[PDB]
Every structure is written in C-alpha cells, then in structure tokens.
Amino acid sequence: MTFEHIISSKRLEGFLRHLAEEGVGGVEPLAKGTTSLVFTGVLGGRKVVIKLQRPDSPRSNFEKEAELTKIASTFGVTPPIIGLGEFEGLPYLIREFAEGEPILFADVEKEHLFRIVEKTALLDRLGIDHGQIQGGKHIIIGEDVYLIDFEKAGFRKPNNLTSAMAMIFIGENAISKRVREKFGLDEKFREEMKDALRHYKRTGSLSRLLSLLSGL
Numbered sequence: 001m002t003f004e005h006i007i008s009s010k011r012l013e014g015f016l017r018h019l020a021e022e023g024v025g026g027v028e029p030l031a032k033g034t035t036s037l038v039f040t041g042v043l044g045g046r047k048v049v050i051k052l053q054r055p056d057s058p059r060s061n062f063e064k065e066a067e068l069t070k071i072a073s074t075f076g077v078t079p080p081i082i083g084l085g086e087f088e089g090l091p092y093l094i095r096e097f098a099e100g101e102p103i104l105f106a107d108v109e110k111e112h113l114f115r116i117v118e119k120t121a122l123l124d125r126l127g128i129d130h131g132q133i134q135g136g137k138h139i140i141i142g143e144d145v146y147l148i149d150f151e152k153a154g155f156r157k158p159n160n161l162t163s164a165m166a167m168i169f170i171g172e173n174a175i176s177k178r179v180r181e182k183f184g185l186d187e188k189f190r191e192e193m194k195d196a197l198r199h200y201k202r203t204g205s206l207s208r209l210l211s212l213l214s215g216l
C-alpha cells in the first residue's frame with residue numbers, strides 16, 4: 001500500500017528521515033485511516049505505531065482523535081503513547097505496538113474475556129464511545145487486551161461493553177462461534193448473558209456478567 005495520492009514522494013522521504021532522527025527506524029506503511037496515515041517502526045529495539053494526520057483530512061478531526069487516544073492511554077485502555085511530534089505542519093503520535101492478534105483472529109481465553117470486560121467497562125466509565133468494536137479489528141488480544149484506533153470515537157453515551165459482549169456471545173459470527181465451541185456455551189448461558197447485559201445497561205452493574213464469566 002502506498003499513500004501517493006495524499007503526500008508527495010518528497011514529503012514521505014522527509015517524514016521517514018524525521019522519524020529516523022527521533023530514533024524510529026525500519027518504518028513501513030500499515031494503513032490509511034479517515035484521519036491519518038499509519039506506519040509501523042522500531043524505536044529502542046521495540047515495535048511502535050506512528051499515526052500522521054492525513055493532509056487531505058481536517059486537522060480538527062485528528063486533534064479530536066488524539067485527545068481521546070491520550071485519555072485512553074492514560075487509563076490503560078489503549079497502548080501507551082510514547083511521543084508526539086509535528087512534521088511539515090502535520091501532527092503525529094507514536095505509541096507502543098501491542099503484540100498479539102485482533103480478536104477477529106485471536107484465540108480467546110477466559111482471562112481475556114475478563115480483561116475485555118474490564119477495558120470496555122473502563123472506557124464506558126470515561127464516557128468515551130470507541131465506535132468500531134464490531135468487526136473485531138480494533139481489540140488486540142495479547143499480553144494485555146487493548147482497544148486501538150479512535151478515529152470514530154467521541155464523548156457520548158458509550159456502548160463499548162455491550163457491543164463487545166454482543167459480538168462475542170450473542171451475535172452469530174466467526175468470533176462467537178469459536179468462543180461458543182471452546183467454552184461449551186449453551187442456550188441457558190446465552191439467556192443469562194442477555195440478562196447480565198440488560199442489568200449492566202440499566203444499573204451499570206457488572207455483578208451478573210462477572211458471575212457468569214467466572215463459571216467459564
């Protein structure tokens with residue numbers, strides 16, 4: 001993948017040199033987002049992600065995403081921010097790369113299920129709706145569980161926990177099928193899960209959900 005309809009070849013060359021001067025090497029394109037161009041690199045012997053404002057996107061959109069990403073980083077929901085910068089008037093952020101698999105492709109253990117609850121309930125308590133839980137590409141299952149990529153996030157009544165649990169336990173998809181077979185989940189479990197989620201929606205209580213997952 002290349003970014004040539006968005007940045008000149010000279011701008012890309014300069015950006016890689018600029019990153020190299022901050023110690024970030026072996027930089028490779030990773031994705032094109034709605035707000036940003038995303039790269040991976042190596043800093044201090046470890047993998048990092050670099051997100052650069054797309055010049056053809058509003059700067060305010062990137063700034064909103066960055067503010068939300070910083071809050072999520074402070075509370076541990078997303079991997080730590082390592083540094084901020086600006087190149088040719090474009091802001092960028094550098095964060096740790098979380099080793100592991102997106103939950104769409106991940107082998108999910110009981111500890112991961114508890115951790116997914118803890119992270120999504122925490123983001124709910126922060127009043128931040130991530131916005132892209134469905135599809136399983138934005139929850140990383142690794143040494144810890146993380147949410148990534150806040151381009152569609154905002155301060156609004158959040159759906160992070162309910163969307164994650166519906167995707168894993170209620171909806172029929174590749175993830176929920178794996179989980180159902182791995183944990184031998186049956187119809188009674190699903191009905192209790194629906195009850196646990198309703199309870200959470202009404203009261204904010206995790207008691208019923210954690211009770212149910214503790215039986216796995």
Ligand SMILES: Nc1nc2c(ncn2[C@@H]2O[C@H](CO)[C@@H](O)[C@H]2O)c(=O)[nH]1
Binds near residue numbers: 049096099138149
């Ligand atoms: N394992 C891992 N994958 C990532 C990370 N950041 C971005 N990605 C990949 O990029 C995609 C969308 O950003 C994800 O679904 C992953 O494949 C990360 O920190 N860890």
